[PDB]
Amino acid sequence: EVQLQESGPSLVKPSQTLSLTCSVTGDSVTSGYWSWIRQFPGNKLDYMGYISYRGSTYYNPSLKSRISITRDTSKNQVYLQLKSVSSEDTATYYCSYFDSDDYAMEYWGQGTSVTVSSGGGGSQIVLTQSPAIMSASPGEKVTLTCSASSSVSSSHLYWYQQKPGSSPKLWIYSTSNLASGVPARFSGSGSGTSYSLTISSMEAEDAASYFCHQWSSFPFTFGSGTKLEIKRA
Ligand SMILES: CN[C@@H](C)Cc1ccccc1
């Protein structure tokens, strides 16, 4: 019902300005937010900011002065402008749509890679995921954990699954609710600063990366992730 597609240069010189476009297609919308999220090499996800249905914007303090998110409703597009880029801005950029009236769904674009040839100040909740890599035999009960540096509302603790060459997919919302498309063998639990995702019985198709995410406090943050691999070569 809602598809997003990012576009723009794949290479930019330092000090130059980065400009990306997100073309939105699908059914009409009566609310919601369009966010820009980037993933650095190593797979760390970074929440950049958003522009709402009413043009209200929020920018991650670490980008505040360099970023601008705008909209051109007549042509159903959202834009991202990041000034004075450096090698630290090399990453895959994704635009995403979310309707706070419906926590169970989130849509992500295909993402577009950008390689480069802190006025703000604030605070953020750090999400730790250990171990970073994990191997399990099919049939094993698997448990992945996520520890927040500060408390977060369980209603705002989400989990995403990502496989190489694909954008993150909403997996669990509000700590223990499975998203559409997720096998019931998955479950989640937790509260305060301690959360977990469990697979009753590891299946081959479950090998992928899993990231926890919190949008209880601004700026929203993502965990470093846990790469789950299967055993037996
Ligand atoms: C669940 N993922 C959040 C980034 C969706 C969102 C976007 C904008 C405002 C609030 C919430």
Determine the Cα–Cα distance for residues 131 and 227; give it in Å rounded to an integer: 8
Write the residue with the smallest CA distance to atom 5 of ligand 1. 98
CATH number belonging to domain 1-121: 2.60.40.10
Determine the Cα–Cα distance for residues 188 and 176; give it in Å rounded to an integer: 4
**Would you state the structure tokens that stand for residue 152, as one six-digit string?**
């977060």
CA of 156 to the centre of ligand 1 (A): 9
Q: Would you call 141 exposed, middle or buried from its count of C-beta atoms within 10 A (0-12, 13-18, 19+)? A: exposed
Half-sphere exposure of 160 (CA within 13 A, CB side): 24
Determine the Cα–Cα distance for residues 146 and 216; give it in Å rounded to an integer: 15
**Would you state the structure tokens that stand for residue 22, as one six-digit string?**
């997100």
Determine the Cα–Cα distance for residues 201 and 199; give it in Å rounded to an integer: 5
Ligand 1 binding pocket includes 33 (Cβ within 6 Å): yes
**Would you state the structure tokens that stand for residue 95, as one six-digit string?**
């635009």
Resolution (angstroms) stands at 1.9
Torsion angle, CA of 22/8/225/147, rounded to 10 degrees?
A: -60
Is the CB of residue 126 less than 8 Å from the CB of residue 217? no
Architecture of the domain delimited by 122-224: Sandwich (2.60)
CA of 171 to the centre of ligand 1 (A): 14
Token pair 């019902």: residue: 1
User: Which string of b and e fits 105-118 if b means at least 16 CB within 10 Å?
Assistant: ebbbbebbebebee
**Would you state the structure tokens that stand for residue 82, as one six-digit string?**
């990041």
**Would you state the structure tokens that stand for residue 19, as one six-digit string?**
């400009």
Question: What experimental approach yielded this model?
Answer: X-ray
CA of 119 to the centre of ligand 1 (A): 23
**Beta strands at 77-82 and 18-26: parallel, antiparallel or unpaired:** antiparallel
Instruction: Using alpha carbons, list the distances in angstroms from residue 199 to 158, 185, 189, 192, 202.
Output: 16, 6, 12, 22, 6
Domain boundaries, the chain: 1-121, 122-224
CA of 12 to the centre of ligand 1 (A): 28
Token pair 């509000």: residue: 174
Is the CB of residue 9 less than 8 Å from the CB of residue 90? no
- C-alpha gyration radius of the chain: 18
Q: Which of 33, 102, 211 to mutate to test the pocket of ligand 1 (most atoms within 8 A of CB)?
A: 33
As beta bridge partners, residue 22 has 6, 78
CA 199 to chain centre: 21
Write the residue with the smallest CA distance to atom 6 of ligand 1. 98
Is the CB of residue 4 less than 8 Å from the CB of residue 98? no
Q: Would you call 137 exposed, middle or buried from its count of C-beta atoms within 10 A (0-12, 13-18, 19+)? A: exposed
Is the CB of residue 196 less than 8 Å from the CB of residue 189? yes
Determine the Cα–Cα distance for residues 61 and 114; give it in Å rounded to an integer: 21
* Domain 1-121 and domain 122-224 have a common topology: yes
CA of 34 to the centre of ligand 1 (A): 8
Ligand 1 binding pocket includes 94 (Cβ within 6 Å): no
HEC-encoded secondary structure of the chain: CEEEEEECCCEECCCCCEEEEEEEEECCCCCCEEEEEEECCCCCEEEEEEEECCCCEEECCCCCCCEEEEEEHHHCEEEEEECCCCHHHCEEEEEEEECCCCCCCEEECCCEEEEECCCCCCCCCCEECCCCEEEECCCCCEEEEEEECCCCCHHHEEEEEECCCCCCEEEEECCCEECCCCCCCEEEEEECCEEEEEECCCCHHHCEEEEEEECCCCCCEECCCEEEEECCC
Token pair 């999400």: residue: 127
Nearest to 60 by CA among 51, 45, 50, 52: 50
